[PDB]
Design a protein around this ligand. Structure first.
Ligand code: 9CR
Ligand code: 9CR
Lengths: 160, 164
């Protein structure tokens, strides 16, 4: 996305689907639980709190992202384990498809996800996710549509 | 029928179950573990012999069953000791997929289930898109759709029982 403006993406986002190779497984173992994300802007850094299911438990991760050479490219430096997240597509109103490249201590991981402001009528967004991820080298076998168990969402709604 | 220039000749053989809708229931789907479902369609004479596999938690079940035509082209009737089923073909491109509507009678649940069959395991994009639109205007929420997990353990048992 060239013309990007983060004021528009602040807040609570529901993780609808992900694609991973890768697955182982993671997420879930058984049963899958849905994930979610909170985007805040904290002192010119993007402060982020995600939740997701991981072998028997709902993980909560709080992270910081610094903007990386314009537009919709962000970078998360973990203990010298980088992640690179790019906004691939967005209609600026209901959904955003994200591309994550992470280096988890040697291991490279290439993830794509579909976030949505809503748990309902995500069909157009889902169809675009399937076109874009096949374009990025993922097959149908690599896409996971999250089951609508909300336990983790609810945990994140409450606080952190 | 709902599609009206249907010929079963076009639909014989192997099909994967890609998604279903049930209300819501739871868981449903399946339970745990989702295991991919599938079907073999055989034309005996005056009868459609169908053999299905699905995960009934402890194992993959192969179930063989018969269907007869029930006036109007795309409509079939299958009777089981559990109840009768009216299945109708709602949509098809005649080449890669079919969306089926099942009105069931299993001892009292006047329920419907819609299922998406496909010829293939990839490039189901447009079929899935359609399926979401049709299930939507038939009373189903996104919550009621079940996109099947690509675990193929039952499927390979179906393929192989039919293969050899
Ligand atoms: C969801 C989302 C966004 C994501 C931002 C970041 C920073 C995502 C990081 C993801 C990681 C780091 C995932 C992982 O490791 O699984 C932005 C604000 C672009 C647009 C609105 C929706
Ligand atoms: C899949 C499929 C077809 C299905 C036929 C029948 C007879 C389905 C019965 C389903 C039941 C009886 C399901 C259940 O109870 O879950 C036909 C040949 C129309 C078109 C090609 C794909």
């Amino acid at each position: 996305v060239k013309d990007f403006d983060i004021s528009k993406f602040l807040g609570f986002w529901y993780e609808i689907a992900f694609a991973s190779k890768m697955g182982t497984p993671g997420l879930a173992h058984k049963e899958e639980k849905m994930g979610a994300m909170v985007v805040e802007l904290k002192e010119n850094l993007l402060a982020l709190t995600t939740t997701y299911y991981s072998e028997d438990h709902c993980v909560l991760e709080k992270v910081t992202a610094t903007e990386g050479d314009g537009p919709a490219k962000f970078q998360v430096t973990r203990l010298s384990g980088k992640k690179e997240v790019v906004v691939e597509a967005t209609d600026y109103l209901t959904y955003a498809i994200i591309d994550i490249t992470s280096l988890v201590a040697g291991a490279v991981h290439r993830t794509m996800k579909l976030y949505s402001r809503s748990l309902d009528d995500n069909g157009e967004a889902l169809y675009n996710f399937r076109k874009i991820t096949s374009d990025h080298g993922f097959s149908e076998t690599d896409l996971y549509i999250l089951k609508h168990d909300l336990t983790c969402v609810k945990v994140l709604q409450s606080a952190a």
